[PDB]
Amino acid sequence: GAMAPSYRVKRMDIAKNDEECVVNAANPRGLPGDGVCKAVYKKWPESFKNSATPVGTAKTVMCGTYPVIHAVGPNFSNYTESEGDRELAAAYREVAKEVTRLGVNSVAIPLLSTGVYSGGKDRLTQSLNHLFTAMDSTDADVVIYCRDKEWEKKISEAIQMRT
Of 123, 151, 155, 158, the residue at the interface with Cl ion (CB under 5 A) is 151
| CA proximity to 47, closest of 21, 19, 12 | 21
* Distance, first Cα to last Cα, the chain: 20
| CA proximity to 14, closest of 102, 142, 156 | 142
Instruction: Identify residues 71-130 at the interface with Cl ion (CB under 5 A).
Output: 115, 117
Binding residue count for Cl ion, defined by CB under 5 A: 8
Cβ–Cβ contacts within 10 Å for residue 135, how many? 21
| Nearer Cβ to Cl ion (13/85) | 13
| Nearer Cβ to Cl ion (79/117) | 117
Of 34, 46, 136, 148, the residue at the interface with Cl ion (CB under 5 A) is 148
Query: Could you please report the per-residue DSSP string of 20-53?
Result: S-EEEE--TT----STHHHHHHHH-GGGGTT---
Task: Quote the CA–CA distance of 32 and 65 in Å, as a whole number.
Answer: 21
Of 6-14, 60-68, 80-88, 123-131, the segment contacting Cl ion by CB under 5 A is 6-14
Binding map of Cl ion across residues 8-47, x = CB under 5 A, - = no contact: ----xx----------------------------------
Q: Which residues bind Cl ion (CB under 5 A)?
A: 12-13, 115, 117, 146-148, 151
Annotated binding-site residue numbers for ADP-D-ribose: 13, 27, 35, 115-117
